[PDB]
Design a protein around this ligand. Sequence first.
Ligand SMILES: O=[P-]([O-])[O-]
Length: 274
Amino acid sequence: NPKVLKVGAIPDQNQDVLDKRFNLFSKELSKQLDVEVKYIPVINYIAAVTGFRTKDLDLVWFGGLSGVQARLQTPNSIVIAQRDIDKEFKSVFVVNKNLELNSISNIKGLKKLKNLRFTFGSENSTSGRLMPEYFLNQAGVEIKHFKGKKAGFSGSHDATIALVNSGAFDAGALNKQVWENNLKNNPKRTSNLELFWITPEYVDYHWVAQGDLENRFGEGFTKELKSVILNLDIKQKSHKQILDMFNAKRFIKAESKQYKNIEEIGRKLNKIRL
Ligand SMILES: O=[P-]([O-])[O-]
């Protein structure tokens, strides 16, 4: 249906959170743009990229890696916006309390994760896989050093927390904002977990739009869409509700140039391929 603006997102958290966030976002866009807007869930990160490529999705909340992948597969698409935090984004490594492992204050301490059961997030996660693996490798830790000579891939930051919290895995890595959200608002999910390490900064999440929206929605639509997202205003109750779900005071401009380092890291780890 070409007259519906279809919103998507990488499934980086439990579906209940995603539904609430993206349905509220969609309703606000629909009011301001005077068009039908619908959030369309997907099963995994690959499905977000491929749904964008096939034009089943028009406007998608991507991670750094998955947004790079999507824009490579889908030429002439548009980087729309990000949060302030997405310019200086971080991961956390977490460990199960039962290990009695002390936190570290230097990257070389990641060697303490060798011979443990370790899970990443999605195979295509920036904060849950790509950057954690990069940092592990800098410490001399490779996937083959983990218990079983393999790592888990949980598919989402909430799922990583749940796996380490249950003792299915000893350790994992995830989005630092998600870790903090769970720690405060869902403390039972984090009862058996301790913060192990906070990573250096890198670029992450961003909105990506199709390049052809004008043909369906009229001249100037993409500009209007970008404007609506950038002008979301913490002082307005309905905007606040949306913005709080993104753990942000505002959205800001983002350009394709800024994802060069993620792309290069992706190439080095053979992760540009889905
Ligand atoms: O790509 P995102 O899960 O940090």
